[PDB]
Every structure is written in structure tokens, then in C-alpha cells.
Design a protein around this ligand. Sequence first.
Ligand SMILES: Nc1nc(N)c2nc(CNc3ccc(C(=O)N[C@@H](CCCNC(=O)c4ccccc4C(=O)O)C(=O)O)cc3)cnc2n1
Length: 386
Amino acid sequence: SWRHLVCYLCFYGFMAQIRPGESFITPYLLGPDKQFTREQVTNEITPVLSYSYLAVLVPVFLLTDYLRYTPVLLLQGLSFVSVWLLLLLGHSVAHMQLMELFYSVTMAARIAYSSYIFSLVRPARYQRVAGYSRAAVLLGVFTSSVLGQLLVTVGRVSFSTLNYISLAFLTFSVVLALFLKRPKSVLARMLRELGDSLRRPQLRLWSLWWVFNSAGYYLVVYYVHILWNEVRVYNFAADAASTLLGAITSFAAGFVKIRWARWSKLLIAGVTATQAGLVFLLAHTRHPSSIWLCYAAFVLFRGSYQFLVPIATFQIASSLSKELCALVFGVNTFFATIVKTIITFIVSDVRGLGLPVRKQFQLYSVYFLILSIIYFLGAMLDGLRH
Ligand SMILES: Nc1nc(N)c2nc(CNc3ccc(C(=O)N[C@@H](CCCNC(=O)c4ccccc4C(=O)O)C(=O)O)cc3)cnc2n1
């Protein structure tokens, strides 16, 4: 129980994140294999992903707490395998929509991995496991992305070979998940315990941070691609550097020894202010011969977010019950998604306060600044009442 538990958990987190062809799904659909039109992919496929994610997060976090997290991790792996099988053996648009449902199912089961790494270790080791596994996962993503780009830049393999490699890696990840140790009204009980746990201050603070900062981080990450496109290899370089720095910062977060009873709100306020500054750097840096500054700003922003995430998960779990952690994570993620949607309704789409990408990033920076000011006020209130 000494080596294999944590080492194999980190190894599975790394390998389950290896999908070289996941960054080239869109071109593969538009390439000379699927022959899908651009409208078809943009309208009938990705909105399916978003809607299915929103409708699938709820059962996932309602059930992963009960069935233990190993079945849900196996389900995530099998859904990734099904996604690539549909990619390699799907001609109609309905097959691709089913693939997007399965991809949303995969995206909804990360809370299972987090709560699983948390349920296998003594609470005194909550932080380090939070720092290690997350880092590994991010490292995996890094490797995945890099691998894909390398296999399409230095190598001459087609998208079909890349998808076959991704399917083989997904099968290996499923085999790895098969050997994971399974830990050893009901809904009314769970809701009452959730409320009682939310009465605790640390859980409130870190769940609020999750809900109102993961949404902003996902908005910035998703919209920075089109922000840079509006103004190729450099895009991948920035993405890979940000992922690697995120893994490094999660690893570092595993090792920090900050007194969280008093210096938790301050830390969140400072990091959120830094993220607001970095988003403003991403937005207002319109000088064409300055893209290194924009890339550095994005890399540092992702590094800060992936530094704060393991701390958030560890402090949420340490102030929770046994069969609650996954549920809480899911709810936060669920709420985060909703928040993001709300913002992406009021800033980009459905008329609303419609603005270009630069103005959207300015509003995201102002949103992060508002959060930072709110958290600074909270820290001042905590200090004044002490
Ligand atoms: N037509 C079409 N259709 C598609 N469906 C499609 N799809 C893709 C895939 N694109 C992504 C990439 C990343 C993410 C994502 O979620 N991004 C996170 C991951 C961090 C990893 N870490 C985790 O979140 C994680 C992963 C595994 C287990 C636990 C965790 C965790 O939360 O700790 C981040 O920060 O970048 C979502 C979609 C590309 N092209 C497409 N084209």
C-alpha cells in the first residue's frame, strides 16, 4: 500500500490525459476523412458537447459519491475509448453528436479523479496528494498536446494514425484504471450534510473561489485562442508552456506550508488580482511586436490558476465528510459552468452587451479585479473581527 497507491494514481492521472488526437478533432472532421462541412461541425456538434456536459454533470456528481470513484473513472476511460471509436468508425453527424455526448461524459468525471486521490490517503497527506496528482494530470495534458503537435509537425503521420495512437493510449489508460483500488432519503441525508459542511467557513471560501474563478479561467482560456487568431506554432508553444507551468505550480502548491486559517482569503485576493492584471495584459497589448508579453501573461495566468486549484481541493476536502468530497466538487464545477454560461451570454452572444474579443477580455479582467476587491474586503473583515 506504500508505493503503488500514490505512484500508480499519479501514473494513471498522467496516462489517462494522453490523447494526441484530441487537439486535432476539428481538422479531422473537416479533413478528407469525414468530409464534414464547417457549419455542420460548428453548429450540430460542439453545442451538443456543451449541452450534454451541462446535463451530464448532475448525475455524475450525484452518483460518483455512492458508487465510489473507481467505477466512474472506468466510465470516463471507456467513454474516451468510445469517443475515439466513434471518431474512427463514424460517418454520419449523429455518430459525431454521440461522440460529443461521450466527450462531455469524460469531461464531467474529473471530480471522480480528484475525490479518488483524496479518498485513498490520510487527511494529513491531503495536500501533497492534491499537489502531486493534479500536477501529473497537467503534465499528461502537456505531453498529450506536445505529442500531437510533434506527430503532425516533425512527423508526417495523418490524422487517422494520430487517432489510432490516441485510441491505443486510451485503451492503455482504461487497462490502468481497471486495477485501481475501490474504496470501502439518501439524497436528503446528502443535502443536509452538504449544507452542514457549507456552514464551515473554509468550505464556503474555497467553493466560492471555485465557482467564481474556474468560470473566469475557462472563459479566458477558451477565448484566448480566437483572441490570438483575430490579430499558429506560437499558439501551440504558448499552450504547452502554460500547461507545463500549471503542472509545475500545482507541484509547488503540494509543498507550500501556509497557515490557511488566516492567510487563505489574502492569498486568493492576491492571486486573483494578479490574474486580473495578466488578463488585462492579454487584452490591451495590441502592439504587433509584443506577443511575447501576451504569451508570458497567459502562461503566468494559467500557472496561478493551476497553483490555486490543488489548494482549493485540499482545503475543501479537509473541511468535509467521508462520502461528500466528489459531490461538492461536482456542485462547484456545475455552478462554475453555469456562471461561465451567464457571462458568455452577457458579453459575447445573443446580442446582449455584444463586444469584440478585446472588449470581452477587458470585461474578464474587470470581473477578476472585482473578485479580487471582494476577497480583499473579506480579508479586511476577517482581520477586523479578530
Ligand atoms: N469538433 C470538436 N469537438 C470536440 N469535442 C473537440 N474537443 C476538443 C478537446 N478540447 C478540450 C481540451 C481541454 C478541455 C479541458 O477541460 N481543459 C482543461 C483540462 C485540464 C486537465 N485537467 C483536468 O481538468 C483533469 C483531467 C482529468 C482528471 C481530473 C482533472 C481535474 O480537474 O483535476 C484545461 O485546463 O485546459 C476541454 C476540451 C478539441 N476539439 C474538438 N473539436
